[PDB]
Design an enzyme around this catalytic site. Structure first.
Site, PDB file in Angstrom:
ATOM      1  N   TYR A  38      65.600 -56.854 -45.300  1.00  0.00           N
ATOM      2  CA  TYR A  38      64.670 -55.759 -45.048  1.00  0.00           C
ATOM      3  C   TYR A  38      65.115 -54.562 -45.884  1.00  0.00           C
ATOM      4  O   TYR A  38      66.300 -54.306 -46.036  1.00  0.00           O
ATOM      5  CB  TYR A  38      64.678 -55.395 -43.564  1.00  0.00           C
ATOM      6  CG  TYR A  38      64.000 -56.437 -42.703  1.00  0.00           C
ATOM      7  CD1 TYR A  38      62.603 -56.545 -42.680  1.00  0.00           C
ATOM      8  CD2 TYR A  38      64.748 -57.315 -41.914  1.00  0.00           C
ATOM      9  CE1 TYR A  38      61.968 -57.500 -41.884  1.00  0.00           C
ATOM     10  CE2 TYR A  38      64.122 -58.279 -41.116  1.00  0.00           C
ATOM     11  CZ  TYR A  38      62.739 -58.364 -41.103  1.00  0.00           C
ATOM     12  OH  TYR A  38      62.117 -59.289 -40.299  1.00  0.00           O
ATOM     13  N   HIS A  40      61.142 -55.800 -46.938  1.00  0.00           N
ATOM     14  CA  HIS A  40      60.543 -56.722 -47.891  1.00  0.00           C
ATOM     15  C   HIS A  40      59.035 -56.555 -47.743  1.00  0.00           C
ATOM     16  O   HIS A  40      58.577 -55.884 -46.825  1.00  0.00           O
ATOM     17  CB  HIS A  40      61.007 -58.171 -47.676  1.00  0.00           C
ATOM     18  CG  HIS A  40      60.798 -58.692 -46.290  1.00  0.00           C
ATOM     19  ND1 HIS A  40      61.846 -58.966 -45.436  1.00  0.00           N
ATOM     20  CD2 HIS A  40      59.670 -59.056 -45.635  1.00  0.00           C
ATOM     21  CE1 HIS A  40      61.373 -59.481 -44.314  1.00  0.00           C
ATOM     22  NE2 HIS A  40      60.055 -59.545 -44.409  1.00  0.00           N
ATOM     23  N   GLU A  58      57.567 -53.873 -44.820  1.00  0.00           N
ATOM     24  CA  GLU A  58      57.938 -53.766 -43.412  1.00  0.00           C
ATOM     25  C   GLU A  58      59.435 -53.526 -43.300  1.00  0.00           C
ATOM     26  O   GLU A  58      60.208 -53.955 -44.158  1.00  0.00           O
ATOM     27  CB  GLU A  58      57.559 -55.026 -42.608  1.00  0.00           C
ATOM     28  CG  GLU A  58      58.110 -56.336 -43.135  1.00  0.00           C
ATOM     29  CD  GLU A  58      57.750 -57.538 -42.270  1.00  0.00           C
ATOM     30  OE1 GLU A  58      58.339 -57.697 -41.183  1.00  0.00           O
ATOM     31  OE2 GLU A  58      56.868 -58.330 -42.671  1.00  0.00           O
ATOM     32  N   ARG A  77      58.086 -53.551 -36.209  1.00  0.00           N
ATOM     33  CA  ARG A  77      58.197 -53.147 -37.621  1.00  0.00           C
ATOM     34  C   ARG A  77      57.348 -51.936 -37.977  1.00  0.00           C
ATOM     35  O   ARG A  77      56.240 -51.782 -37.463  1.00  0.00           O
ATOM     36  CB  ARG A  77      57.735 -54.273 -38.561  1.00  0.00           C
ATOM     37  CG  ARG A  77      58.291 -55.659 -38.291  1.00  0.00           C
ATOM     38  CD  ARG A  77      59.662 -55.912 -38.909  1.00  0.00           C
ATOM     39  NE  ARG A  77      60.115 -57.268 -38.591  1.00  0.00           N
ATOM     40  CZ  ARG A  77      60.797 -57.584 -37.496  1.00  0.00           C
ATOM     41  NH1 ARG A  77      61.130 -56.642 -36.615  1.00  0.00           N
ATOM     42  NH2 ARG A  77      61.107 -58.846 -37.253  1.00  0.00           N
ATOM     43  N   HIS A  92      55.627 -58.427 -33.132  1.00  0.00           N
ATOM     44  CA  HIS A  92      55.356 -59.834 -32.883  1.00  0.00           C
ATOM     45  C   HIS A  92      55.046 -60.023 -31.396  1.00  0.00           C
ATOM     46  O   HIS A  92      54.313 -60.931 -31.027  1.00  0.00           O
ATOM     47  CB  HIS A  92      56.558 -60.704 -33.262  1.00  0.00           C
ATOM     48  CG  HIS A  92      56.707 -60.908 -34.732  1.00  0.00           C
ATOM     49  ND1 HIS A  92      55.690 -61.415 -35.513  1.00  0.00           N
ATOM     50  CD2 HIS A  92      57.752 -60.699 -35.568  1.00  0.00           C
ATOM     51  CE1 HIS A  92      56.101 -61.513 -36.763  1.00  0.00           C
ATOM     52  NE2 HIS A  92      57.351 -61.085 -36.823  1.00  0.00           N
TER      53      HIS A  92
END
EC number: 4.6.1.24
Length: 104
Positions: A38, A40, A58, A77, A92
């Site tokens: 991260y 990415h 993110e 994120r 998520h």
């Protein structure tokens, strides 16, 4: 209500800015942290209608308020672009598979 609510995590706009800022510095420097590298590119496979230009990137935002530094990223994120503009906050949690839902 919280500026942002991802699953059961409450985030303020300053919380988001803080994660965004850490993600952006790594991005402009071409560096990353964590086994998943991260920040990415955020592919936006879910088709969120962001108002800022792409490509998107993110970076995790943690429930502890701490800046992500390579541990378990959790589900939340912040999404930003190379103009250092906030595209949105996603998670998520509440989604299936690798999918995302926007935080509320």
């Amino acid at each position: 209500a919280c500026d942002y609510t991802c699953g059961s995590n409450c985030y303020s706009s300053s919380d988001v800015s803080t994660a965004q800022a850490a993600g952006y510095k790594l991005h402009e420097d071409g560096e990353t942290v964590g086994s998943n590298s991260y920040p990415h590119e955020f592919r936006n496979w879910n088709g969120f209608d962001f108002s800022v230009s792409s490509p998107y990137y993110e970076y995790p935002i943690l429930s502890s308020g701490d800046v992500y530094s390579g541990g378990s990223p959790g589900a939340d994120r912040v999404v930003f672009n190379e103009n250092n503009q906030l595209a949105g906050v996603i998670t998520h949690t509440g989604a299936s598979g690798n999918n995302f839902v926007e935080c509320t």
